[PDB]
DNA sequence: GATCATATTGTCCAGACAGT
DNA sequence: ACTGTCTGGACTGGTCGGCGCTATGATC
C-alpha cells in the first residue's frame, strides 16, 4: 500500500541514536588518495554513499544516482556545547540547582505550573510566556528549595562560554569557566519530571543531548564531491569543515592519550568547540567565520537551511520544474483570450503524456508513426509496466505496431491543449492563467492583448514562461479553475481586469462617435474580421451619394445581447445638460422611444436599450480595465463564455476600425496658435512676478508664518502653490485650445493611453520640478546651479520649467527635469523591493487561511479567525463594486425585463 | 507613491501591518462638542488646551551668563 | 462620566450566558480554546465587569453586512 | 444543490484519471479527444457517477 | 628530481537589559 | 516603573549572457 506523513515530531538526537544511525566511523581527515579512490575511514567513504558513477556503496550496494546516502558518527574526545542550544542551555543552567539537579521552584509552584501548562492548551505564545516566567522566577533563587544548597549566578558569554560567579574563602568574587563536561554532568542530574517545566521533552529533548559528545557526519550524497575541468576534485565547504573537525579531534585524542597538561587540553577543547560551532553555523556572532585557503568564508548547515538561496526557500518552497518553456511575447489579436501562441520548436519539445484508450488509439498511433521530427508527433513511449523508450527513426514503426491500450504516448503540443502561462513577478493569483495551445511556425510566444493587463505585460522585450501540466488531474484543474475567461473580474476590487486597452478604446470611440458612418463593403469586412454571425446586413441608417451607410452604433449593437439595457455617463462628459435631459427622459418613461433618444442623443451618456446603442460613445468606461461598466454587467448577467466571445469580437472590431479609418499622431498635435502661446507667456510672467513679490515680502519680514510653521517652509509652500496654480491655468488653456479632433486628445479623454497632463506637458509647460515633495535645493551653497545668483529663491532658479517639450528646455531646465526623472526612477526602484518584502510577509502570515464548508475562516490549529468571510460570506470577485448585492441594478434589470 | 506629515502610501501600510508601537509622525483627529464646534474662538481655546507648549519654543534667544550663573 | 461604548469605533459588547456559550460551541463545532481571545485587562472587559473564562459577544458595524456578530474568549494576561 | 468550482475540478480530474487507466466512457466519444475532454463531456451530459462528500 | 601531512581561529525595527 | 543601550535579523522575484577561483614548504 501507500502511506503519507501524517505528522512530524521534532527533538534532539541522542548520542546512542547517532551511533545506531551511523554506518561507519570517521577518523581520517581526508577524502581521496593520489589515484582518486576514497580512503577507508575517511569522509568520502563508500559506507556513507557514492557520488562517482563507477563506485558502489558499501552499506546498501547501490550505485550512484540511486543510493540515498548514509550518515556517519565521530566520537569526540571531549563534549562540545551545541551553539544552537547554547543559550537555551544557559537558561537551564539558570533554572536547575548545581547539586540536586531539580528546578529551583517549590513543590506547590511546580504543581501550579503543571496545571497552568495543562489548562492553556497548545498556543505557542502562552507556552513561551510561561517558560520565560518560570525561568525568571527560578533564576532569582540562590537556595535550592529541595536540597538547600547555595546557588551562584551564571554569566553566559557568546557563543558557548559559561562563567560561574563564585566566592572564595576571603569573600572575593571570581569567575570560573564551566567546561562542557561539567555542563553536561550538571544537565544529566535533571530528572524527567522537571523537564516540562524547562520546556524540554522527557523522552525527546533531554538536556544532556544539548551538549554534543558524538558528531553526526552527513552522508556523501548530501555533500557531494565533483571533478573540475582541470582534473582536480572540488570539495564542499562542509567537507573542509569536517576535515578540520576530524583533524582537531584526532589531535585532542592524541594529546589526551599522551597525558598532556591542562593547558594543552583546554586549548584543544576550545579549538574543537570553535570548529563545531562554525560547522553548525558559520555566521555565529562573536567568532570569526571559517574561511577557505583562498579567503572565501564557508557556508555550513545553518546557511544551507536559511536565506533566500537556502533549502527552505530556494529548493523547497520554490524550485525549478520540468516541462516548462520561456521566451519573448508578441501581440496577437487574432487569437482568443483563451489561447496562447506556442512556437513549433517549443511544441515539438514539450510533450503531453497521453494514455492510449479506446477512443484516442488511432490519433496516438499516428503521433507515434510521425516521430519526433514530424509534427504532430511523439517523443517518448511508456509501456504499462513502466519502461520509457525514446522514439528514434529505427523503432518508430516498431513501437507504433506494438501500441496497445494502457500505453502512454508523450505526444507533441497540439491545438486545444491546456497549458499554464505565467509572467514574473507574480504579485497576484491572476498573474498565471491556463490558456489553449495555438501552434504557429515563428519563434516567439503570442498572447492576446486583453490578457496583458492581468499579466502587467507590455511587448518591449517582455519574457514569459509556459508550464505544461502532465497528470490528468493537473490538466483538469488548470482547465476548470485557472482558465482565462474565468478570471475576467479582478477579486482585488470586484471590477473588470481582462478588458480592452489603448487601440481597443480608440477604435470603439471612432466607431461609436457621432457622425461615424461606414459603407456596405466596410461593414461586411469588419463583420467578417470580428467573426460575428451576422448573416444579413441591417437596415442602413442613411443614404449618401446614392449608396447605403451604416452607423457605427448599429454595428456595435450587434455585439451586445438582445436583452441588455444599461445607461451611465462616461469620461467624455463636458455638457451635463444633455446628460441630465437623457437621464430625465429615461426616468419618466423607463422605455424611451429610440427615435426620441436619437433626437437628443449625446456622446457623453452611454445608453443601450434592448442591445441597441442608442446614445453615447465607447471609451474606457465601456469595457476598459477597472472602469468598464458594460463589460462588468455582461460578465455578471451573461456568464463568462458569452463575455469572452463579446470581448474577442469587440476587440477585433475596434482593431479593424482603428486600422482602416486611420489613427495617427504628429508634431502638429501639440501645436498651439500664437494666442495660446501669448496667454501661456502672460501666465508665466504673472507667476514669476508673484514669486518675486513673495520673496520680497519674506525678505522685508511682513510675510506671515503659517500656524506651526516658520518663514522658510511657509514661503516655499506659497511658492509651490503659486506654481501649481500657474500649471493648472496653463493646462486649462491648452485643453481649451485643443479640440476633440486631435487624436492625442482623443486618447487622453477616452482613457485609451496617456493623460491630459501629458498633452499639457508637451504643449504648454513642464511645471515645477520637485524632489522628495519639495523644490530642488541640492547643489551648491545657496543655489542649485552656478548659473544663478547665490541665495536666489526664484521659480526659474529652483526647478520651475517655463517651456514645454515642443519648445525645448533650457540646459538648466533640462538638468532640473533630469533631477526629477532620476528621483522618480529611484522612487520606483526603492518601492519595488519594499512592496515585495511586504507582500511576502503578508502571504506568509495569511497563507493558511481558507473558507470552510460552513462559511467560516479558520487557521489549521482550529481557531475561528472569522465566523463568516467578509462578515457576509460574499466573494469580492463576485461582489458588485464592493457591495453584497446591487439592488439598483437588479431592480432596474428585472423591471425592464418584465416591461419589455 | 512614496513621500500635515501624514507619511501616507507604502510606508504607512508597512507601519500599519508591522504593528509599530510609535508610528512616524503620529496624528490624532480631535472632535469637539456642540459648545465648541460652531465658533472659532472656542475651537482655538480648546486647541490651545490640547496643545503642549513649552517655554523653550516660546524662547527666542539663548544665552547663559556667568555673573549670576 | 464617559462610557467607552459611546465611541463610534467601539462596537457593542454583551456577556454570553453559559447556555448561550454552549449554543455557540455547538453551532461551529469548536472547543473553548478555538475561539478568538480577548485580554482580561481590555477596557471593554473591565467596563462589562467580565472575568476570564467567559465569552463576549460583539455586535460590530459591518460595511458589507450592516451588523456582524463576533465572539471572543476572555483570557488572563 | 450546486457544484463548486473546486468540486467540479476535482471530479473532472478524478474522472480523467480513471479514463486514462481504464473506466470505459459512459457516453459516445468523437474518436480522438483526450481523456480530459471525455470527462468534460461526461460532466456536460450529467452522467458522472462521482459524488462529493460534504461535512454536516 | 618525485612525494606528503598540514593548511589561523549600512538602515531600520524589534526584543532583552542595566541604570535611575 | 520609565529610558537609553546592546544585540539580532532582513533588505521584490525571475531571466539572458559572461569571468574567474577553489596549495604548499619540507623530505630522500
Ligand atoms: Mg516591459
Ligand atoms: Zn548506499
Ligand atoms: Zn538542589
Swiss-Prot record, chain B:
* Top-rank taxon: Archaea
Localization of this protein: Cytoplasm; Chromosome
Function field: DNA-dependent RNA polymerase (RNAP) catalyzes the transcription of DNA into RNA using the four ribonucleoside triphosphates as substrates. Forms part of the jaw domain.
Family indicated by similarity: Belongs to the RNA polymerase beta' chain family.
The record's subunit annotation is:
Part of the RNA polymerase complex.
* Name of the featured protein: DNA-directed RNA polymerase subunit Rpo1C
Swiss-Prot record, chain C:
For whether the record's keyword set contains Cytoplasm, the answer is: yes
Query: What Enzyme Commission number does this protein have?
Result: 2.7.7.6
- Keyword terms of this UniProt record: Cytoplasm, DNA-directed RNA polymerase, Nucleotidyltransferase, Transcription, Transferase
The places in or outside the cell where this protein is found are: Cytoplasm
GO molecular function per UniProt? DNA binding; DNA-directed RNA polymerase activity
Among InterPro entries, the record links this protein to: Arch_Rpo5/euc_Rpb5, RNA_pol_subH/Rpb5_C, RNA_pol_subH/Rpb5_CS, RPB5-like_sf
GO CC, alphabetical: cytoplasm; DNA-directed RNA polymerase complex
Reaction(s) catalysed (UniProt annotation): RNA(n) + a ribonucleoside 5'-triphosphate = RNA(n+1) + diphosphate
Report the superkingdom from the record: Archaea
Enzyme class at the top of the EC tree = transferase
The GO biological-process annotations, alphabetized, read as: DNA-templated transcription
Note the Pfam families from the entry: RNA_pol_Rpb5_C (PF01191)
Q: Does the keyword Glycosyltransferase apply?
A: no
Matches recorded under SUPFAM superfamilies: RPB5-like RNA polymerase subunit (SSF55287)
Assembly and partners are described as: Part of the RNA polymerase complex.
The UniProt family comment states:
Belongs to the archaeal Rpo5/eukaryotic RPB5 RNA polymerase subunit family.
> Its biological function?
DNA-dependent RNA polymerase (RNAP) catalyzes the transcription of DNA into RNA using the four ribonucleoside triphosphates as substrates.
> What's the name of the protein?
DNA-directed RNA polymerase subunit Rpo5
* Natural source organism: Thermococcus kodakarensis (strain ATCC BAA-918 / JCM 12380 / KOD1)
Amino acid at each position: 500500500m501507500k502511506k503519507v506523513i501524517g505528522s512530524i515530531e521534532f527533538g534532539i538526537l541522542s548520542p546512542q541514536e547517532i551511533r545506531k544511525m551511523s554506518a561507519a566511523e570517521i577518523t581520517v581527515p581526508d577524502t581521496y588518495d593520489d589515484d582518486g579512490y576514497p580512503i577507508e575511514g575517511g569522509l568520502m567513504d563508500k559506507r556513507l554513499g557514492v557520488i562517482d558513477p563507477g563506485l558502489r556503496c558499501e552499506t546498501c550496494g547501490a550505485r550512484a544516482g540511486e543510493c540515498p546516502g548514509h550518515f556517519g558518527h565521530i566520537e569526540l574526545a571531549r563534549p562540545v556545547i551545541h551553539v544552537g542550544f547554547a543559550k537555551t542551555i544557559h537558561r537551564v543552567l539558570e533554572s536547575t540547582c548545581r547539586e540536586c539537579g531539580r528546578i529551583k521552584l517549590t513543590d506547590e509552584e511546580i504543581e501550579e505550573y503543571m496545571q497552568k501548562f495543562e489548562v492553556m492548551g497548545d498556543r505557542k505564545g502562552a507556552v513561551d510566556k510561561l517558560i520565560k516566567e518560570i525561568h525568571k522566577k527560578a533564576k532569582e533563587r540562590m537556595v535550592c528549595p529541595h536540597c538547600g544548597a547555595p546557588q551562584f549566578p551564571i554569566k553566559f558569554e557568546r557563543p558557548t562560554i559559561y562563567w560561574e560567579l563564585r566566592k572564595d574563602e576571603e569573600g572575593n568574587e571570581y569567575k570560573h569557566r564551566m567546561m562542557p563536561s561539567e555542563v553536561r554532568d550538571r544537565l544529566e542530574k535533571i530528572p524527567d519530571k522537571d523537564l516540562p517545566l524547562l520546556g524540554l521533552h522527557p523522552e525527546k529533548s533531554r538536556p544532556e543531548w544539548m551538549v554534543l559528545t558524538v558528531l553526526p557526519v552527513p552522508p556523501v550524497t548530501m555533500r557531494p564531491s565533483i571533478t573540475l575541468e582541470s582534473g582536480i576534485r572540488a570539495e564542499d565547504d562542509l567537507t573542509h569543515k569536517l576535515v578540520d573537525i576530524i583533524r582537531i579531534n584526532n589531535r585532542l585524542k592524541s594529546n589526551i592519550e599522551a597525558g598532556a597538561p591542562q593547558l594543552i587540553i583546554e586549548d584543544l577543547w576550545d579549538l574543537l568547540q570553535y570548529h563545531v560551532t562554525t560547522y553548525i553555523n558559520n555566521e555565529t556572532s562573536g567568532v570569526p567565520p571559517a574561511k577557505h585557503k583562498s579567503g572565501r568564508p564557508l557556508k555550513t548547515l545553518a546557511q544551507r537551511l536559511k536565506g533566500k538561496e537556502g533549502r527552505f526557500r530556494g529548493n523547497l518552497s520554490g524550485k525549478r520544474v520540468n516541462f516548462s518553456a520561456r521566451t519573448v511575447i508578441s501581440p496577437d489579436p487574432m487569437i482568443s483570450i483563451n489561447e496562447v501562441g506556442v512556437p513549433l520548436a517549443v511544441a515539438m519539445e514539450l510533450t503531453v503524456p497521453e494514455k492510449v484508450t479506446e477512443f484516442n488509439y488511432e490519433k496516438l498511433k499516428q503521433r507515434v508513426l510521425n516521430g519526433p521530427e514530424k509534427y504532430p508527433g511523439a517523443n517518448y513511449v511508456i509501456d504499462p509496466e513502466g519502461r520509457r523508450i525514446r522514439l528514434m527513426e529505427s523503432n518508430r514503426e516498431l513501437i507504433a505496431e506494438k501500441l496497445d491500450i494502457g500505453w502512454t504516448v508523450e505526444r507533441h503540443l497540439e491545438d486545444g491543449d491546456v497549458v499554464l502561462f505565467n509572467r514574473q513577478p507574480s504579485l497576484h493569483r491572476m498573474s498565471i492563467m491556463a490558456h489553449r495551445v495555438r501552434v504557429m511556425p515563428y519563434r516567439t510566444f503570442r498572447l492576446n492583448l486583453p490578457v496583458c493587463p492581468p499579466y502587467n505585460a507590455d511587448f518591449d522585450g517582455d519574457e514569459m514562461n509556459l508550464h505544461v501540466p502532465q497528470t490528468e488531474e493537473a490538466q483538469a484543474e488548470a482547465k476548470i479553475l485557472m482558465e482565462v475567461q474565468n478570471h475576467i473580474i479582478s477579486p482585488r476590487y470586484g471590477g473588470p481586469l481582462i478588458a480592452g486597452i489603448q487601440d481597443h478604446i480608440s477604435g470603439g470611440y471612432l466607431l461609436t462617435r457621432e457622425g461615424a458612418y461606414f459603407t456596405r463593403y466596410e461593414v461586411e469586412q469588419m463583420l467578417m474580421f470580428a467573426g460575428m454571425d451576422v448573416n444579413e446586413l441591417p437596415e442602413p441608417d442613411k443614404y449618401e451619394n446614392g449608396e447605403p451607410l451604416w452607423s457605427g452604433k448599429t454595428i456595435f449593437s450587434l455585439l451586445l445581447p438582445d436583452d441588455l439595457t444599461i445607461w451611465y455617463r462616461n469620461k467624455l462628459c463636458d455638457e451635463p445638460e444633455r446628460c441630465e435631459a437623457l437621464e430625465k427622459l429615461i426616468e419618466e418613461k423607463l422605455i424611451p422611444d429610440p427615435e426620441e433618444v436619437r433626437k437628443l442623443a449625446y456622446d457623453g451618456f452611454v445608453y443601450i436599450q434592448n442591445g441597441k446603442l442608442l446614445s453615447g460613445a465607447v471609451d474606457k468606461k465601456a469595457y476598459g480595465r477597472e472602469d468598464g461598466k458594460l463589460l462588468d454587467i455582461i460578465v455578471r448577467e451573461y456568464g463568462v463564455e458569452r463575455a469572452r466571445q463579446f470581448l474577442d469580437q469587440v476587440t477585433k472590431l475596434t482593431i479593424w476600425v482603428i486600422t482602416h479609418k486611420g489613427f495617427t499622431t504628429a508634431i502638429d498635435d501639440e501645436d498651439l496658435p500664437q494666442e495660446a502661446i501669448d496667454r501661456i507667456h502672460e501666465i508665466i510672467r504673472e507667476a514669476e512676478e508673484k514669486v518675486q513679490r513673495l520673496i520680497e515680502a519674506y525678505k522685508r519680514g511682513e510675510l506671515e508664518p503659517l500656524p506651526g510653521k516658520t518663514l522658510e517652509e511657509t514661503l516655499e509652500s506659497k511658492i509651490m502653490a503659486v506654481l501649481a496654480e500657474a500649471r493648472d491655468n496653463a493646462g486649462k488653456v491648452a485643453e481649451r485650445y485643443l479640440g476633440m479632433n486631435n487624436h492625442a486628445v482623443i486618447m487622453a479623454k477616452t482613457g485609451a493611453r496617456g493623460k491630459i497632463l501629458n498633452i499639457t506637458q508637451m504643449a504648454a509647460m513642464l511645471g515645477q520640478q520637485s524632489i522628495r515633495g519639495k523644490r530642488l535645493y541640492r547643489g551648491y551653497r545657496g543655489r542649485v546651479l552656478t548659473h544663478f545668483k547665490p541665495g536666489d529663491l526664484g521659480a526659474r532658479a529652483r526647478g520651475f520649467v517655463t517651456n514645454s517639450y515642443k519648445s525645448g528646455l533650457t540646459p538648466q531646465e533640462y538638468f532640473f527635469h533630469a533631477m526629477g526623472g532620476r528621483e522618480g526612477l529611484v522612487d520606483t526602484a526603492v518601492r519595488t523591493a519594499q512592496s515585495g518584502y511586504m507582500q511576502r510577509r503578508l502571504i506568509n502570515a495569511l497563507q493558511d487561511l481558507k473558507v470552510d464548508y460552513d462559511g467560516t475562516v479558520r487557521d489549521p490549529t482550529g481557531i475561528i479567525v472569522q465566523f463568516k468571510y467578509g462578515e457576509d460570506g460574499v466573494d469580492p470577485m463576485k461582489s458588485w463594486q464592493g457591495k453584497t448585492v446591487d439592488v439598483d441594478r437588479v431592480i432596474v434589470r428585472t423591471l425592464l425585463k418584465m416591461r419589455g | 507613491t512614496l513621500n500635515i506629515n501624514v507619511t501616507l502610501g507604502l510606508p504607512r501600510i508597512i507601519e500599519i501591518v508591522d504593528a509599530r508601537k510609535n508610528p512616524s509622525t503620529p496624528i490624532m483627529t480631535v472632535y469637539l462638542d456642540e459648545e465648541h464646534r460652531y465658533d472659532r474662538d472656542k475651537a482655538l481655546e480648546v486647541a490651545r488646551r490640547i496643545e503642549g507648549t513649552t517655554l523653550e519654543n516660546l524662547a527666542r534667544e539663548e544665552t547663559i551668563d556667568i555673573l549670576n550663573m | 462620566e464617559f462610557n467607552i461604548f459611546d465611541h463610534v469605533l467601539v462596537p457593542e459588547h454583551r456577556i454570553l450566558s453559559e447556555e448561550e456559550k454552549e449554543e455557540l460551541l455547538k453551532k461551529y463545532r469548536i472547543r473553548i480554546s478555538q475561539l478568538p481571545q480577548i485580554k482580561a485587562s481590555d477596557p471593554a472587559v473591565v467596563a462589562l465587569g467580565a472575568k476570564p473564562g467567559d465569552v463576549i459577544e460583539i455586535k460590530r458595524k459591518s460595511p458589507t453586512a450592516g451588523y456582524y456578530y463576533y465572539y471572543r474568549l476572555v483570557v488572563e494576561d | 444543490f450546486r457544484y463548486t468550482r473546486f468540486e467540479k475540478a476535482r471530479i473532472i480530474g478524478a474522472r480523467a484519471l480513471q479514463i486514462a487507466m481504464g473506466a470505459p466512457v459512459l457516453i459516445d466519444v468523437p474518436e480522438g479527444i483526450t481523456p480530459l475532454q471525455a470527462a468534460l463531456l461526461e460532466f456536460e451530459k450529467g452522467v458522472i457517477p462521482i459524488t462529493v462528500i460534504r461535512p454536516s
